[PDB]
Design a protein around this nucleic acid. Structure first.
Ligand SMILES: [Cl-]
Ligand SMILES: [Cl-]
Ligand SMILES: [Cl-]
Ligand SMILES: [Cl-]
Ligand SMILES: [K+]
Ligand SMILES: [Mg+2]
Ligand SMILES: [Mg+2]
Ligand SMILES: [Mg+2]
Ligand SMILES: [Mg+2]
Ligand SMILES: [Mg+2]
Ligand SMILES: [Mg+2]
Ligand SMILES: [Mg+2]
Ligand SMILES: [Mg+2]
Ligand SMILES: [Mg+2]
Ligand SMILES: [Mg+2]
Ligand SMILES: [Mg+2]
Ligand SMILES: [Mg+2]
Ligand SMILES: [Mg+2]
Ligand SMILES: [Mg+2]
Ligand SMILES: [Mg+2]
Ligand SMILES: [Mg+2]
Ligand code: NA
Ligand code: NA
Ligand code: NA
Ligand code: NA
Ligand code: NA
Ligand code: NA
Ligand code: NA
Ligand code: NA
Ligand SMILES: [Sr+2]
Ligand SMILES: [Sr+2]
Ligand SMILES: [Sr+2]
Ligand SMILES: [Sr+2]
Ligand SMILES: [Sr+2]
Ligand SMILES: [Sr+2]
Ligand SMILES: [Sr+2]
Ligand SMILES: [Sr+2]
Ligand SMILES: [Sr+2]
Ligand SMILES: [Sr+2]
Ligand SMILES: [Sr+2]
Ligand SMILES: [Sr+2]
Ligand SMILES: [Sr+2]
Ligand SMILES: [Sr+2]
Ligand SMILES: [Sr+2]
Lengths: 92, 56, 237, 194
RNA sequence: GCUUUACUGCAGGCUGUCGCUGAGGACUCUCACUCCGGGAGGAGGACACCGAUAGCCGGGCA
RNA sequence: ACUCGUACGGUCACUGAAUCCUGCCCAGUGCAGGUAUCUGAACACCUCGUACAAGAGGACGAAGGACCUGUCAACGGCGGG
RNA sequence: GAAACAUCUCAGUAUCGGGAGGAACAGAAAACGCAACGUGAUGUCGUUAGUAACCGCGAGUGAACGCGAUACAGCCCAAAC
């Protein structure tokens, strides 16, 4: 489906309607220094490694929209519940 | 030739004999080792914890 | 499953051992300091159980009675020489350096002084081709060009008993008598004829190796069976 | 002023540099041709021996012991085991090589008791340690105020029960506080979790 | 119990790397170390063996 | 252990005396060889990060793989129209 | 056991190798960290506490400091000269 790159809507930070810009959330890189990372190194060794021997699952036929709604005035963004969209293209 | 009665007739070999060290008829005269006390195998006496129940 | 036969062998139990207590002697070259003044007389010709070929008993000058890896043409009464200054004749032993090019040799040493390693079986011979101050090139019975130290000792002539392989055993019993004189389990039961538990090729209604026979060089023992690291198979191509 | 001993000590701080490097390169050729346990007349590291209790007295023996280098020499499981108890290659033993060396020495000298030991190097395939043993039955020792303690009955086969300094360190008894909850007073009494 | 391109691992083989290991992306040397030799000595050589680790193969095995 | 053995040897497999014979297929799988280029770990090295360290990235790249080749008395195949 | 099962559990249990004693082991701080102007070798008992911590964060596993008791005891080398 199509969607406007920018549109007026409620900004929970300004507490009033402002023009927002929508952007698909890009995955941030991991640091490899979180507790889980250390548990992987600690609990992995010889033989089976329990949960760390499991390999990541599959995919759903369609994914929900993953977007950031950034307010045009204060520059702060906010998240929203996503909806299943086979494809999401922006207008402008 | 069956493995039972007919094969029992061929048994006239002496193996286990009275042991010089413990007195039991367990000294294997061919191996020269006592299956009971371990004479001929070890200076120490043959003994095992599994010879009794674990907590006794 | 169960360890296959090839693994049982390694343990070196009675069934797989050679009848060593029945063997005569290792036909190694004599150890001479120098001067070549070591010659002897062939006192008798004997059968060697380990190689199914004749071997010669020699009585050397210094009083040493030893069995020798005999080439063809050696007979009782004949005098044999061993050393640097030995005469270039059949049955004589001397380093490759002293041997003239284009002369059939046998019982060739791998490393000077080892006593002989190459070309020792019935009828075979190595061929001394190229000479040098640093390396003697010898063609082995397998057709391989082997570079050796010119100081390696060897016996002039081909090994006695040639043509042994030319007559068929004809019957199982004949093979039997020969195998009793070797370190080998015989007869041979095909892998495909055993149960799945006993060999990689066992099992399945009709007999057939349920997999390709060409096995990798890296395969572990128990799996390394069939055609070991074959560069090719068949007769064509 | 600095003792003569301090120089032997300082040399041994960097066994791969200076004169010591050449000494070791020479010696090891001879050591490699020696047995598992060779009694020596004098310690190779005098300062260390004297520091550990050595004395140029009757009843004091020093022996060099060599042990194969690396991990455990373990036989793979015959019967079934969970992947966790299947490993064979990376598993190492709980006793350090120095401790193995001390025991081999004491066994060679059944009447003697291990006093202490120290390292004297290693090559790519083995390690060497010199063990100081004492004769608890010799009067020159029963009369020594600094060593007569080793003559007591409870000191018999002390090395086999982990009473040596290397034994105690290996059992995790170094720290008196944090970290020694499962080591003191014994590994066994703490359920062998140390 | 058995099979395999089932899951997960383990031996084993191959391969790189670090230690053993020295002197003057290709090389020479000898002194460790290895092999042959009764010995003298010869061959080889910082490689190989061995310890450690990494990647690949891995129903041979659990 | 084989081995007091050395290719006329002995190891690993298949077929199963003699006689007359043994066609076609290397695409897949297996084995083996080669390989410009692609891919390919760790150590050391370089960039960022941390007064350090964790960590991120880079360069180089072994076997292996991709790719090419050889091979069926190698696993096997030799149909429908 | 986890109602399968691989980490985990059963368990450092059964069993094996070595060794001492009447008891063993531990033990006079490179401690503790109720952070203090505080405690003062070590065992053990009660408690702290199924607490902190661990863990397919599942099933389960699981201390310590301190406190109240028991008994109390502190010393010897190496080196300097
Ligand atoms: Cl989206
Ligand atoms: Cl034959
Ligand atoms: Cl002792
Ligand atoms: Cl306190
Ligand atoms: K289990
Ligand atoms: Mg011979
Ligand atoms: Mg036989
Ligand atoms: Mg057959
Ligand atoms: Mg059958
Ligand atoms: Mg099988
Ligand atoms: Mg068939
Ligand atoms: Mg040798
Ligand atoms: Mg299985
Ligand atoms: Mg058939
Ligand atoms: Mg048949
Ligand atoms: Mg269960
Ligand atoms: Mg746990
Ligand atoms: Mg206790
Ligand atoms: Mg569950
Ligand atoms: Mg626990
Ligand atoms: Mg605490
Ligand atoms: Na840990
Ligand atoms: Na002793
Ligand atoms: Na069954
Ligand atoms: Na094909
Ligand atoms: Na259950
Ligand atoms: Na079950
Ligand atoms: Na767990
Ligand atoms: Na209080
Ligand atoms: Sr761990
Ligand atoms: Sr693992
Ligand atoms: Sr799906
Ligand atoms: Sr029968
Ligand atoms: Sr009988
Ligand atoms: Sr015995
Ligand atoms: Sr016992
Ligand atoms: Sr020989
Ligand atoms: Sr010899
Ligand atoms: Sr089959
Ligand atoms: Sr053909
Ligand atoms: Sr004793
Ligand atoms: Sr035929
Ligand atoms: Sr092919
Ligand atoms: Sr007190």
């Amino acid at each position: 489906m199509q969607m406007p790159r920018r549109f007026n809507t409620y900004c929970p930070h300004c507490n009033e309607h402002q023009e927002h810009e929508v952007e698909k959330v890009r995955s941030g890189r991991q640091t490899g220094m979180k507790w889980i990372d250390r548990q992987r190194e600690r609990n992995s060794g010889i033989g089976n490694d329990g949960k760390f021997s499991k390999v990541p699952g599959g995919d759903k036929p369609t994914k929900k929209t993953d977007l950031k709604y950034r307010c045009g005035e204060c520059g702060k963004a906010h998240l929203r519940e996503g909806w299943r969209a086979g494809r999401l293209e922006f207008q402008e | 030739t069956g493995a039972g009665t007919p094969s029992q007739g061929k048994k006239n070999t002496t193996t286990h004999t009275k042991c010089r060290r413990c007195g039991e008829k367990s000294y294997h005269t061919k191996k020269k080792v006592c299956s009971s006390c371990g004479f001929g195998k070890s200076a120490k006496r043959r003994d095992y914890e599994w010879q009794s129940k674990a907590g006794e | 499953g169960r360890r296959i036969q090839g693994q049982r062998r390694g343990r070196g139990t009675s069934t797989f051992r050679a009848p060593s207590h029945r063997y005569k002697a290792d036909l190694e070259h004599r150890k001479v300091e120098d001067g070549d003044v070591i010659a002897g007389t062939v006192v008798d010709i004997e059968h060697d159980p380990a190689r199914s070929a004749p071997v010669a008993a020699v009585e050397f000058e210094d009083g040493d009675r030893r069995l020798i890896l005999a080439p063809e043409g050696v007979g009782v009464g004949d005098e044999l020489q061993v050393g640097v200054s030995a005469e270039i004749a059949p049955g004589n032993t001397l380093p490759l350096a002293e041997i003239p090019e284009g002369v059939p040799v046998c019982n060739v040493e791998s490393s000077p002084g080892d006593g002989g390693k190459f070309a020792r079986a019935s009828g075979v011979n190595a061929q001394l081709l190229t000479h040098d101050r640093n390396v003697a090139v010898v063609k082995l019975p397998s057709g391989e060009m082997k570079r050796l130290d010119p100081q390696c000792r060897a016996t002039i002539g081909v090994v006695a008993g040639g043509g042994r392989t030319d007559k068929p055993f004809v019957k199982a019993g004949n093979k039997h008598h020969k195998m009793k004189a070797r370190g080998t389990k015989w007869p041979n039961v095909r892998g495909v004829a055993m149960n799945a538990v006993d060999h990689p090729f066992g099992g399945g209604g009709r007999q057939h190796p349920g997999k390709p026979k060409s096995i990798s060089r890296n395969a572990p023992p128990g799996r390394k069976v069939g055609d070991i690291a074959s560069k090719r198979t068949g007769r064509g191509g | 002023a600095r003792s003569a001993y301090s120089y032997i000590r300082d040399a041994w701080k960097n066994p791969g540099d200076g004169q010591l490097a050449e000494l070791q390169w020479q010696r090891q050729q001879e050591w490699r041709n020696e047995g598992a346990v060779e009694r020596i007349e004098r310690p190779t590291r005098l300062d260390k021996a004297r520091s550990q209790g050595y004395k140029a007295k009757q009843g004091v023996i020093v022996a060099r012991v060599s042990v194969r280098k690396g991990s455990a020499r373990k036989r793979r499981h015959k019967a079934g085991r969970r992947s966790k108890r299947q490993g064979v290659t990376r598993i190492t033993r709980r006793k350090d090589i120095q401790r193995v060396a001390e025991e081999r020495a004491s066994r060679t000298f059944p009447n003697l008791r291990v006093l202490n030991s120290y390292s004297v190097g290693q090559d790519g395939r083995q390690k060497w340690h010199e063990v100081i043993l004492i004769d608890p039955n010799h009067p020159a020792i029963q009369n020594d105020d600094d060593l007569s303690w080793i003559c007591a009955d409870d000191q018999a086969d002390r090395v086999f029960r982990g009473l040596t300094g290397a034994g105690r360190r290996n059992r995790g008894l170094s720290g008196k506080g944090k970290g020694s909850e499962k080591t003191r007073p014994s590994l066994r009494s703490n359920g062998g979790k140390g």
